[PDB]
């Protein structure tokens, strides 16, 4: 059965904010070691993959895995009742037709409970993550959001190019061209602002700006973002959670 209680409804709301808009259907599966969820957009260029370990919850009980699919829009519609500080418990039996969201305030006072209708989705979780990527980099997610928000205005394509000690984002369209160049650096005054880069091979990939814009939402879940690029597979943008992570795999252009 499904029985997962989040300390703050806010965490779940931000996680769902990440799937929001860019995907319509999400397939969740709870099990002994936590909850995972996957959603693929219609064009199949973006995969949103979530993992929340048992420790991210205030209470988690699972003696029998349950897989459940649902419409993302329906879920978010209901995901603004958490008061953020409310407690949220996800509940479902072993053969569910619905998923119950139970928000409660500390005191017995107010109890908002929802029963969301589920969709039947053929279980087919993808495992496209690579052992090694050509290059790996992490930087503050707010910085990544700005970089994406800058360039987006110029083109529907933003190119990411990596060479030794150099990361360069570029957009070129009608009104002109733009570029943002960043360099690796360790800031001891607070390392959450550092920019790391490990390059095994220079990379140069192009992504659709509309998708990178969907991805930047993860900033609200983590201070830093990890970006893993390869010429052999979809790029991985990852936002770590306390016991877990939200991952976005994006297929490069041609």
């Amino acid at each position: 059965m499904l029985e997962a209680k989040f300390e703050e409804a806010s965490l779940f709301k931000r996680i769902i904010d990440g799937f929001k808009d860019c995907v319509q259907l999400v397939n969740f599966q709870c099990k002994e070691d936590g909850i995972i969820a996957q959603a693929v957009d219609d064009s199949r260029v973006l995969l949103v993959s979530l993992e929340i370990g048992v420790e991210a919850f205030q209470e988690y009980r699972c003696d029998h895995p349950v897989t459940l699919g649902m419409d993302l829009t329906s879920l978010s519609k209901i995901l603004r009742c958490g008061n953020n500080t409310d407690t949220l418990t996800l509940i479902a039996d072993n053969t569910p037709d619905s998923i119950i969201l139970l928000f409660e305030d500390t005191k017995k006072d107010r109890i908002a409970e929802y029963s969301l209708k589920l969709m039947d989705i053929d279980a087919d979780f993808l495992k496209i993550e690579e052992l090694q990527y050509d290059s790996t980099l992490s930087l503050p997610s707010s910085e990544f959001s700005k970089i994406v928000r800058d360039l987006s205005q110029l083109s529907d394509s933003i190119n990411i190019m990596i060479t030794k000690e150099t990361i360069k984002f570029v957009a070129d369209g009608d009104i002109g061209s733009g570029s943002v160049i960043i360099k690796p650096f360790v800031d001891m005054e607070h390392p959450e602002t550092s920019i790391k880069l490990e390059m095994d091979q220079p990379v140069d990939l192009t992504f659709g700006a509309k998708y990178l814009l969907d991805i930047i939402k993860g900033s609200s879940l983590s201070d830093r973002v990890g970006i893993r690029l390869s010429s052999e597979a979809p790029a991985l943008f990852q936002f770590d959670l306390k016991s877990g992570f939200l991952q976005f795999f994006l297929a490069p252009k041609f």
Partner: peptide, 10 residues
């Protein structure tokens, strides 16, 4: 289509 794609109620 949204009603058809939905799952049957318990």
């Amino acid at each position: 289509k949204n009603f058809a794609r939905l799952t049957v109620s318990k």
